[PDB]
Design an enzyme around this catalytic site. Structure first.
Site, PDB file in Angstrom:
ATOM      1  N   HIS A 185       0.987  39.194 -30.873  1.00  0.00           N
ATOM      2  CA  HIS A 185       0.002  39.714 -29.913  1.00  0.00           C
ATOM      3  C   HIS A 185       0.432  39.491 -28.450  1.00  0.00           C
ATOM      4  O   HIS A 185      -0.203  40.017 -27.535  1.00  0.00           O
ATOM      5  CB  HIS A 185      -1.413  39.179 -30.206  1.00  0.00           C
ATOM      6  CG  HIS A 185      -1.698  37.817 -29.653  1.00  0.00           C
ATOM      7  ND1 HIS A 185      -1.652  36.676 -30.423  1.00  0.00           N
ATOM      8  CD2 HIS A 185      -2.086  37.419 -28.417  1.00  0.00           C
ATOM      9  CE1 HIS A 185      -1.965  35.630 -29.680  1.00  0.00           C
ATOM     10  NE2 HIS A 185      -2.240  36.054 -28.458  1.00  0.00           N
ATOM     11  N   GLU A 217      10.256  24.796 -17.407  1.00  0.00           N
ATOM     12  CA  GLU A 217       9.117  24.867 -16.492  1.00  0.00           C
ATOM     13  C   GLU A 217       8.190  23.671 -16.613  1.00  0.00           C
ATOM     14  O   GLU A 217       7.918  23.197 -17.716  1.00  0.00           O
ATOM     15  CB  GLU A 217       8.285  26.118 -16.774  1.00  0.00           C
ATOM     16  CG  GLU A 217       8.939  27.412 -16.348  1.00  0.00           C
ATOM     17  CD  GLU A 217       8.824  27.669 -14.852  1.00  0.00           C
ATOM     18  OE1 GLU A 217       8.518  26.723 -14.088  1.00  0.00           O
ATOM     19  OE2 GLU A 217       9.034  28.821 -14.432  1.00  0.00           O
ATOM     20  N   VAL A 262       5.901  26.982  -8.859  1.00  0.00           N
ATOM     21  CA  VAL A 262       6.840  26.339  -7.940  1.00  0.00           C
ATOM     22  C   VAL A 262       8.195  26.177  -8.618  1.00  0.00           C
ATOM     23  O   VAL A 262       8.264  25.730  -9.766  1.00  0.00           O
ATOM     24  CB  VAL A 262       6.335  24.937  -7.519  1.00  0.00           C
ATOM     25  CG1 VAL A 262       7.321  24.272  -6.555  1.00  0.00           C
ATOM     26  CG2 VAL A 262       4.943  25.027  -6.890  1.00  0.00           C
ATOM     27  N   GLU A 287      14.485  24.845 -13.988  1.00  0.00           N
ATOM     28  CA  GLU A 287      14.202  26.120 -14.637  1.00  0.00           C
ATOM     29  C   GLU A 287      15.462  26.902 -14.979  1.00  0.00           C
ATOM     30  O   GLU A 287      16.484  26.799 -14.299  1.00  0.00           O
ATOM     31  CB  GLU A 287      13.332  27.020 -13.755  1.00  0.00           C
ATOM     32  CG  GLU A 287      11.971  26.451 -13.403  1.00  0.00           C
ATOM     33  CD  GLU A 287      11.949  25.701 -12.085  1.00  0.00           C
ATOM     34  OE1 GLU A 287      13.025  25.338 -11.561  1.00  0.00           O
ATOM     35  OE2 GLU A 287      10.836  25.467 -11.574  1.00  0.00           O
ATOM     36  N   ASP A 303       1.027  36.994 -37.215  1.00  0.00           N
ATOM     37  CA  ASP A 303       1.082  36.977 -35.749  1.00  0.00           C
ATOM     38  C   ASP A 303       2.287  36.178 -35.266  1.00  0.00           C
ATOM     39  O   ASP A 303       2.167  35.041 -34.790  1.00  0.00           O
ATOM     40  CB  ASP A 303      -0.222  36.425 -35.162  1.00  0.00           C
ATOM     41  CG  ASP A 303      -0.334  36.642 -33.662  1.00  0.00           C
ATOM     42  OD1 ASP A 303       0.484  37.401 -33.101  1.00  0.00           O
ATOM     43  OD2 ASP A 303      -1.246  36.048 -33.044  1.00  0.00           O
ATOM     44  N   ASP A 319      -9.200  22.006 -27.541  1.00  0.00           N
ATOM     45  CA  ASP A 319      -8.723  23.236 -28.176  1.00  0.00           C
ATOM     46  C   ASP A 319      -7.664  23.917 -27.308  1.00  0.00           C
ATOM     47  O   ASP A 319      -7.520  23.600 -26.126  1.00  0.00           O
ATOM     48  CB  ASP A 319      -9.923  24.181 -28.366  1.00  0.00           C
ATOM     49  CG  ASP A 319      -9.674  25.305 -29.370  1.00  0.00           C
ATOM     50  OD1 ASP A 319      -8.620  25.347 -30.034  1.00  0.00           O
ATOM     51  OD2 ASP A 319     -10.572  26.165 -29.491  1.00  0.00           O
ATOM     52  N   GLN A 354      -7.120  30.865 -23.964  1.00  0.00           N
ATOM     53  CA  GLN A 354      -6.483  32.039 -23.376  1.00  0.00           C
ATOM     54  C   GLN A 354      -5.304  31.648 -22.483  1.00  0.00           C
ATOM     55  O   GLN A 354      -5.460  30.837 -21.575  1.00  0.00           O
ATOM     56  CB  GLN A 354      -7.520  32.806 -22.556  1.00  0.00           C
ATOM     57  CG  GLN A 354      -7.044  34.130 -22.004  1.00  0.00           C
ATOM     58  CD  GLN A 354      -8.177  34.987 -21.456  1.00  0.00           C
ATOM     59  OE1 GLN A 354      -7.974  36.160 -21.152  1.00  0.00           O
ATOM     60  NE2 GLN A 354      -9.376  34.407 -21.332  1.00  0.00           N
ATOM     61  N   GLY A 355      -4.133  32.220 -22.752  1.00  0.00           N
ATOM     62  CA  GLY A 355      -2.921  31.909 -21.992  1.00  0.00           C
ATOM     63  C   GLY A 355      -2.009  30.908 -22.683  1.00  0.00           C
ATOM     64  O   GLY A 355      -0.836  30.794 -22.333  1.00  0.00           O
ATOM     65  N   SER A 402      -1.638  31.316 -25.874  1.00  0.00           N
ATOM     66  CA  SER A 402      -1.141  32.264 -26.879  1.00  0.00           C
ATOM     67  C   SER A 402       0.366  32.285 -26.994  1.00  0.00           C
ATOM     68  O   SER A 402       1.059  32.398 -25.986  1.00  0.00           O
ATOM     69  CB  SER A 402      -1.576  33.685 -26.513  1.00  0.00           C
ATOM     70  OG  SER A 402      -2.928  33.897 -26.822  1.00  0.00           O
ATOM     71  N   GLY A 403       0.864  32.192 -28.224  1.00  0.00           N
ATOM     72  CA  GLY A 403       2.289  32.299 -28.489  1.00  0.00           C
ATOM     73  C   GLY A 403       3.027  30.982 -28.404  1.00  0.00           C
ATOM     74  O   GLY A 403       4.177  30.893 -28.817  1.00  0.00           O
TER      75      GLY A 403
HETATM   76  N1  LIG Z   1      -9.232  28.556 -29.040  1.00  0.00           N
HETATM   77  C1  LIG Z   1      -8.220  29.305 -29.762  1.00  0.00           C
HETATM   78  C2  LIG Z   1      -7.612  30.392 -28.897  1.00  0.00           C
HETATM   79  C3  LIG Z   1      -6.237  30.565 -28.892  1.00  0.00           C
HETATM   80  C4  LIG Z   1      -5.678  31.555 -28.105  1.00  0.00           C
HETATM   81  C5  LIG Z   1      -6.489  32.372 -27.323  1.00  0.00           C
HETATM   82  C6  LIG Z   1      -7.884  32.250 -27.294  1.00  0.00           C
HETATM   83  N2  LIG Z   1      -8.650  33.049 -26.511  1.00  0.00           N
HETATM   84  C7  LIG Z   1      -8.306  34.287 -26.144  1.00  0.00           C
HETATM   85  C8  LIG Z   1      -9.340  34.730 -25.336  1.00  0.00           C
HETATM   86  C9  LIG Z   1     -10.271  33.708 -25.243  1.00  0.00           C
HETATM   87  C10 LIG Z   1      -9.811  32.646 -25.990  1.00  0.00           C
HETATM   88  C11 LIG Z   1      -8.409  31.227 -28.107  1.00  0.00           C
HETATM   89 CA   LIG Z   2       8.583  25.979 -11.986  1.00  0.00          CA
END
Ligand SMILES: NCc1cccc(-n2cccc2)c1
Ligand SMILES: [Ca+2]
Length: 223
Positions: free
Chosen positions: A40, A52, A57, A62, A84, A171, A174-175, A177-178
């Site tokens: 995704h 990083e 900065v 890097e 995924d 937890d 967002q961000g 991810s991956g």
């Molecule tokens: N809390 C699990 C998780 C992992 C990756 C992304 C998201 N997420 C994407 C949009 C809002 C939360 C949640």
């Molecule tokens: Ca940097």
């Protein structure tokens, strides 16, 4: 990462940032030429940023290397997020050192209760929005398949596992991810999905990397 801690600069040497003008996803360096991330996170024009800490900065450790090819898993379904996982090849090999290092693939799957390290530059708030500049870390256990399925009825496949805390508060988000879920020095998971972040009974869901080792090895061997 919500409810985590500041990792410390270059203490997670396999953690990469995928950049397309801005950070948009994490990834894990698995050898000098290859990164594993979430399917995704696929897009064109990816620059892989290794070594990083503060992503805003240039701090001196890097390496910025453009992707030559991305390979989304053949069975990735973007609706269900089953499978995924994606591989990204670097245009040139990274120079490996103490601060830029590969992470081992698993030789077996990690069990419920195993302690893992999850990391990334994702949102640090469960309600609001705040993005950190430096890498954040969270120690979290793998949850049982049964508790994972109970948390998300009808949505957990054999290629997914839950990790974190059913009480909430801690937890991925967002961000992130991956990015990596590393347990006992092996890459067992990829930050995949959930329902919001750090909410009660809605733990993080992660791609089960041990299911993909054969695909990863064979793909690398011919690309
Ligand atoms: N809390 C699990 C998780 C992992 C990756 C992304 C998201 N997420 C994407 C949009 C809002 C939360 C949640
Ligand atoms: Ca940097």
């Amino acid at each position: 990462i919500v409810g985590g801690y500041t990792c410390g600069a270059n203490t997670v040497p396999y953690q990469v940032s995928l950049n397309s003008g801005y950070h948009f996803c994490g990834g894990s360096l698995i050898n000098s030429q290859w990164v594993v991330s979430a399917a995704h996170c696929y897009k064109s024009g990816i620059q892989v940023r290794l070594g990083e800490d503060n992503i805003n900065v240039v701090e001196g450790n890097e390496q910025f290397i453009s992707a030559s090819k991305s390979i989304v898993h053949p069975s990735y379904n973007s609706n269900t997020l089953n499978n995924d996982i994606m591989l990204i090849k670097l245009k040139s090999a990274a120079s490996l050192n103490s601060r830029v290092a590969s992470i081992s693939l698993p030789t077996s799957c990690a069990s419920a209760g195993t302690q893992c390290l999850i990391s990334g530059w994702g949102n640090t708030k469960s309600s609001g929005t705040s993005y950190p500049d430096v890498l954040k870390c969270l120690k979290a256990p793998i949850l049982s398949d049964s508790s994972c399925k109970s948390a998300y009825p009808g949505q957990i496949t054999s290629n997914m596992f839950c990790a974190g805390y059913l009480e909430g508060g801690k937890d991925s988000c967002q961000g992130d991810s991956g990015g990596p879920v590393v347990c006992s020095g092996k890459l067992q998971g990829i930050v995949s999905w959930g329902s919001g972040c750090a909410q009660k009974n809605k733990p993080g869901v992660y791609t089960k990397v041990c299911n993909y080792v054969s695909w990863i090895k064979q793909t690398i061997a011919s690309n």
